Amino acid sequence: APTPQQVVQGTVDELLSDIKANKAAYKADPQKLYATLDRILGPVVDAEGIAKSVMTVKYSRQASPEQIKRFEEVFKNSLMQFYGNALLEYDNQDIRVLPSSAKPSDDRASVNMEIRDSKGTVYPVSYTMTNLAGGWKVRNVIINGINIGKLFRDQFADTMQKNRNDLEKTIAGWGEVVAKAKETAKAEEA
Ligand SMILES: CCCCCCCCCCCCCCCC(=O)OC[C@H](COP(=O)(O)OC[C@@H](O)CO)OC(=O)CCCCCCC[C@@H]1C[C@@H]1CCCCCC
Ligand SMILES: CCCCCCCCCCCCCCCC(=O)OC[C@H](COP(=O)(O)OC[C@H](O)CO)OC(=O)CCCCCCC[C@@H]1C[C@@H]1CCCCCC
């Protein structure tokens, strides 16, 4: 069986080489890029675990499985809509998966990497992995010190309090949280 390090390295190599070979077709049709993303990342992403992680048990247990699913989709689709093109504009950059001692039989692990971009500007990116029945999957992403999972966890709680714990209202507006997540991170970084 593979280790979380290999699952990361393999996914990075597969996705980057796939984008490089088809960079022209994706720039012309983003729906093709979105499909390839779902095909490559889908198997290695714990979408339901991430959704529940952002909602917290306090709110997920007030939601139906059909509702949690609809929250996954708004999350996925909005992430691709506002941050999918980023994988095309700068796929010329370098990535380095840093060492790790995690074994395949482990139940949890964190895999760190570095992204050298624009003349060598390095930001760390970390992936919190969890070993499930379907193998190792991403459960959280930390970027340059910003716990993205906790960021959305806080935004979800703030929006739920404003909507008087209306899940439907929160889901119908979650696209706007994702769209602003980048500046939300920049402000929290300065
Ligand atoms: C169940 C279904 C699963 C499917 C889910 C779909 C998920 C969608 C994926 C969305 C990807 C997010 C990219 C970050 C966007 C960003 O942040 O916006 C530009 C950035 C800002 O930075 P910067 O401050 O320079 O520019 C800002 C100026 O506006 C200031 O003026 O820059 C860049 O382009 C850097 C891009 C480099 C990223 C490439 C790294 C490797 C790729 C991601 C894969 C690896 C995944 C492996 C998974 C493990 C199993
Ligand atoms: C439900 C489905 C989930 C699917 C999960 C799939 C995993 C995909 C993993 C994608 C990793 C991409 C990392 C590149 C970002 C970057 O290289 O950008 C740095 C800059 C900060 O550094 P700067 O301050 O610019 O440094 C400059 C000097 O300071 C000058 O002085 O931009 C930023 O802020 C980055 C932060 C933007 C926030 C958007 C988050 C979207 C992203 C897709 C993930 C989230 C997945 C869900 C998480 C829930 C647990």
Automatic annotation (TrEMBL):
- Keyword Hydrolase on this protein? no
State the superkingdom: Bacteria
Is the keyword Metal-binding in the record?
no
Pfam families in UniProt: MlaC (PF05494)
Mind listing the UniProt keywords for this protein, alphabetically? Signal
Protein name as it appears in the record: Toluene tolerance protein
Species: Pseudomonas aeruginosa (strain ATCC 15692 / DSM 22644 / CIP 104116 / JCM 14847 / LMG 12228 / 1C / PRS 101 / PAO1)
What is the phylogenetic placement of the source species in the record?
Bacteria, Pseudomonadati, Pseudomonadota, Gammaproteobacteria, Pseudomonadales
